[PDB]
């Protein structure tokens, strides 16, 4: 539908919109006029991906100067597939309207799990083993040995892509992972390296977060592309958690024992290759002395492992010290390994700053700072040198070498915390070593430096006052869009009152209180007896879901929940969860009642979305606090007190509410979807915790619904479902919660859309 | 159960519900933050029950 969004025509790929839609489109015109970042909040009602891709395609169709390339970033591979197919719908609409005058290269991109063909690599199930066999079958040196012989191993895909495939760009076709694999089958190529080679020619690229924010993966979108690039994150609550997962490094005693075995293996390899060859070691010493390890770096496609984990602006251009002879570098890694192993021997929890660890190094095993920076460059050049094949075998030592880089680079923001035993362990032999970071800003800092205008957008983000206060961030637009409705469409209730008038809570900190778990089971039973077609029940921790569903069996509850609906409990297997989800979705459609109870942290509620009739009543059990984790929490909170200015009790409440309202706000797809969404404990009524739920849920949280009983909540659920199971046809929306062609041109509608959207 | 998990899998893992590979870059416990997820130690009696 041909929108006027105050400067430009926009072909919306549906012949109807919401008003929330056009408010979002106004504010995103605002963010792309002035080159600034902006944080938006469209709730899950609209097609925010639909709108988002529509306006970015409108700018790229209308302005070939300011915006070169869209980099969408959605976090899970099914969301990659969804965003590609909505882009494909919009191109099909775009080509219905005009004809085959498209040229538009949509492109997904994930990994060698999902773009490899070869029938000996394909039956591997893991990412590192697929990377190892792809490093076996092609390299910089195995490819040359095949190039001057015949029977040496090769893929036939990368070789044929090397033969012809690097001169024909992909003509204007929006490609999924499946379509791209099919084109790799067709002419006979690698679609992995085709996708990476065709990053340069695309207009929309849709990959994951860790393919952009990791400094040791994202070396594939250069500066000149980034100066006119628009990056759009999507579902971006845990950006700070992605950063802290993206730069912290964990060392384990098993990692160090396999590092010792690796060190002996590489010592034997240096001995036998010293018996074999000498001339390329002379060339090694040349390209260390002469250059800065870039001699054979021009032809480097599959010879690249994970790069140096320092950021793009803190790397150096000097010569690697005393390291040069590989015998002495094995001695260097030997010293570093034995010192970190001796440091890990301490049988109490020890927190250090990284300069204290560097001084303990530089005093007690004589290793200085700059040869400890260049350890990543040295191990990558050495491991390229000695022709060795299966790099999965060398996963620990590279880890250790990469750990060395971080210890020798960053200070005052990061923290080296040593644990002799974990929290749920105590006194079992797992001494681990978190080089943990707590600057969230030091991983998105080159993302704001390089890129023009990055757009954090999610359905839930609250409060918006804190994402500039964590990410070292100053946006143009800080927008919240109010859910305008012609029908209530949702009701949140805070069931914080047992049927015995017992205060429902989780104050006990996972050590079971009996009557509260009793009232949780009573809530689940009676809400099962009311709600149709699938109830989703998020607990706090898997130990707590474990303990709760344990004491729902010895206590006589869970058979009654069986009598009403079919349970599908969760486990932390990767395949058992998928089978329980599949049976849960085959039981919401074959008549019976299905109820999926999970944990509000894991992968069950990150990508796997619950649409019109899969979850009607999202039961958020408890307030999700990170309670199991170590002094990483205390140290990140001490950091946010000190060098940012964010309180203890402010950040804990913010984190708990972003997880709770993250897991709740998936139930609703459109305006014609209705989701009961209950919150079950009293703490969600206490003003600060309720104050950090998003605006489109606080708008429909009535003071009567605030602190309901179990049975009052059940009767509100019954009245909700009965008032909201009637024919709510399209003719009930054209006034309020929908807009036609000609309902847009009225300036009264423009006054309405001015009144809907607000800023912070 | 192991035949449903290993010899079989999720049939409608086509665009959702594929919980094993709903993450494009899954690694080992080496270079992460939450590496203490599945512990090879700590097997109790009531917990296994």
């Amino acid at each position: 539908m041909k929108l006027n969004v105050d400067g430009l025509l926009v072909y919306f790929p549906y012949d109807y919109i919401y008003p929330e839609q056009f408010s979002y489109m106004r504010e995103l015109k605002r963010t792309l006029d002035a080159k600034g970042h902006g944080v938006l909040e469209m709730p899950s009602g609209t097609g925010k991906t639909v709108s988002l891709l529509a306006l970015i395609m409108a700018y790229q169709r209308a302005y070939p100067l300011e915006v070169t390339k869209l980099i969408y970033c959605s976090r899970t591979v099914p969301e990659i597939e969804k965003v590609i197919e909505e882009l494909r719908k919009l191109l099909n609409f775009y080509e219905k309207q005009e004809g085959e005058k498209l040229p538009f290269l949509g492109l997904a991109l994930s990994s060698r799990k999902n773009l490899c063909i070869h029938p000996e690599v394909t039956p591997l199930r893991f990412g590192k083993d697929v990377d190892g066999k792809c490093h076996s079958l092609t390299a910089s040196y195995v490819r040359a040995q095949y190039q001057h012989d015949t029977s040496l191993p090769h893929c036939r895909f990368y070789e044929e892509f090397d033969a012809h495939g690097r001169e024909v760009p992909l003509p204007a076709g929006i490609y999924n992972l499946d379509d791209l694999k099919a084109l790799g089958r067709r002419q006979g190529w690698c679609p992995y390296f085709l996708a990476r080679y065709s990053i340069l020619h695309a207009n929309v690229v849709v990959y994951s977060y860790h393919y952009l924010l990791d400094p040791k993966i994202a070396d594939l979108v250069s500066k000149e592309l980034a100066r006119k690039a628009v990056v759009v994150f999507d579902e971006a609550h845990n950006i700070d958690n992605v950063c802290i997962d993206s730069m912290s490094v964990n060392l384990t005693r098993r990692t160090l024992d396999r590092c010792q075995g690796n060190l002996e293996t590489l010592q034997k390899t240096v001995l036998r290759i010293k018996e074999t060859d000498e001339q390329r070691l002379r060339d090694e010493y040349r390209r260390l002395v002469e250059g800065x390890x870039x001699x054979x770096x021009x032809x480097x496609x599959x010879x690249x492992x994970x790069x140096x984990x320092x950021x793009x602006x803190x790397x150096x251009x000097x010569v690697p010290g005393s390291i040069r002879t590989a015998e002495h570098f094995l001695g260097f890694l030997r010293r570093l390994l034995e010192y970190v192993k001796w440091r890990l021997r301490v049988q109490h929890v020890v927190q250090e700053s990284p300069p204290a660890f560097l001084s303990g190094l530089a005093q007690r095993v004589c290793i200085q700072r700059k040869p400890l920076r260049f350890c990543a460059e040295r191990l990558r050049s050495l491991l390229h040198t000695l022709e060795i094949t299966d790099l999965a075998d060398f996963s620990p030592l590279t880890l250790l070498a990469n750990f060395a880089t971080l210890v020798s680079t960053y200070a005052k923001g990061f923290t080296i915390i040593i644990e002799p035993f974990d929290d749920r362990t105590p006194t079992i032999a797992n001494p681990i070593l978190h080089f943990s970071c707590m600057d969230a800003s030091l991983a998105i800092k080159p993302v704001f430096e390089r890129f023009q205008s990055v757009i954090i957008t999610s359905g839930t983000l609250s409060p918006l006052d804190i994402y500039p206060k964590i990410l070292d961030f100053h946006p143009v637009t800080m927008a919240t869009f109010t859910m305008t409705l012609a029908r209530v469409c949702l009701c949140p209730m805070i069931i914080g009152r047992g049927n015995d008038q017992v205060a429902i809570s989780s104050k006990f900190e996972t050590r079971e209180d009996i009557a509260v778990i009793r009232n949780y089971g009573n809530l689940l039973l009676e809400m099962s007896a009311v709600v149709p077609d699938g109830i989703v029940a998020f607990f706090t921790s898997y130990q707590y879901m474990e303990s709760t569903v344990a004491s729902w069996y010895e206590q006589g509850i869970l058979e009654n929940i069986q009598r009403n609906k079919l349970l599908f409990i969760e486990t932390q297997d990767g395949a058992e969860t998928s089978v329980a989800l599949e049976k849960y979705q085959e039981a919401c459609e074959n008549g019976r009642g299905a109820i999926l109870l999970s944990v509000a942290r894991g992968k069950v509620s990150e990508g796997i979305d619950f649409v019109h009739h899969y979850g009607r009543a999202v039961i958020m059990f408890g307030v999700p606090y990170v309670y199991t984790q170590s002094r990483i929490l205390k140290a990140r909170l001490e950091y946010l007190r000190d060098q940012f200015q964010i309180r203890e009790n402010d950040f804990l409440t913010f984190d708990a509410m972003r997880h709770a309202a993250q897991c709740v706000g998936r139930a609703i797809r459109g305006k014609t979807d209705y989701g009961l969404m209950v919150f079950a404990d009293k703490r969600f009524a206490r003003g600060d915790k309720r104050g950090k739920l998003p605006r489109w849920i606080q708008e429909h949280l009535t003071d009567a619904n605030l602190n309901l009983t179990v049975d009052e909540g059940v009767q509100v659920a019954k009245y909700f479902l009965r008032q909201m199971a009637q024919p709510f046809h399209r003719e009930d929306q054209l006034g309020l919660s929908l807009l036609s062609l000609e309902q847009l041109e009225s300036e009264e509608t423009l006054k309405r859309i001015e009144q809907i959207a607000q800023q912070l | 159960x192991x035949x449903x998990x290993x010899x079989x899998x999720x049939x409608x893992x086509x665009x959702x519900x594929x919980x094993x590979x709903x993450x494009x870059x899954x690694x080992x416990x080496x270079x992460x933050x939450x590496x203490x997820x599945x512990x090879x130690x700590x097997x109790x009696x009531x917990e296994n029950s």
Partner: protein
């Protein structure tokens, strides 16, 4: 602390993870129980390769590779000398080659002939013990002192941050409690219309917090 186990008097490391191992000239292993059990039975006779220990030649450290102990001790005794920093050379390649020469001298004292090594040490140690070696001893002592001073400054700042936030909490708690008790003792013993005095109380609370 879980290594294969002490050679001679095998009890220490298998039972007690509270020890440390001492190396000899030839450099294999000796624990404190080995040390004492060996000193009572010869005092300077290697347990396996019978090397002629010069004079009591034992050094206690905490590592579980003997070549690591050898390299650490020899590396300290070499890097006591050869102290020319990057400040001291004109170019960068000469400094990196100098560090590689130091690595060559350490690996030669590891296994090669110790004669030419000692002559090279004679020349460089004399020619630079004139000027540079003592100067860099002084400078490294200065940097050790200032790093210990800077770590104590960091810990003073952390103690002040802890204690000042504690005094923030206790000052606001005692002060708000005295505000409330004073407002009760002023509702009692005054004669005002009620809404004005209650507005003064709310003004006291807002001027207290904000």
């Amino acid at each position: 602390m879980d290594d294969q186990g002490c050679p001679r008097c095998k009890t220490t490391k298998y039972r007690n993870p509270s020890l440390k191992l001492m190396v000899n000239v030839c450099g294999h292993t000796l624990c404190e129980s080995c040390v004492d059990l060996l000193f009572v039975r010869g005092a300077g006779n290697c347990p396996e390769c019978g090397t002629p220990l010069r004079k009591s030649n034992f050094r206690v450290q905490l590592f579980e590779d003997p070549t690591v102990d050898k390299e650490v001790e020899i590396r300290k005794k070499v890097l006591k000398i050869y102290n020319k920093r990057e400040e001291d050379f004109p170019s960068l390649r000469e400094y990196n080659d100098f560090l590689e020469e130091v690595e060559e001298i350490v690996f030669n004292l590891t296994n090669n002939v110790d004669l030419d090594n000692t002559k090279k040490k004679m020349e460089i140690y004399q020619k630079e013990n004139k000027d540079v070696i003592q100067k860099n001893k002084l400078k490294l002592t200065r940097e050790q002192e200032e790093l210990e001073e800077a770590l104590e400054v960091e810990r003073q700042e952390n103690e002040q941050r802890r204690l000042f936030i504690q005094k923030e909490e206790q000052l606001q708690q005692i002060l708000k409690r005295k505000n409330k008790q004073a407002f009760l003792d002023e509702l009692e013993s005054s004669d005002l219309p009620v809404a004005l005095l209650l507005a003064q109380h709310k003004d006291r609370s807002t001027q207290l917090e904000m």
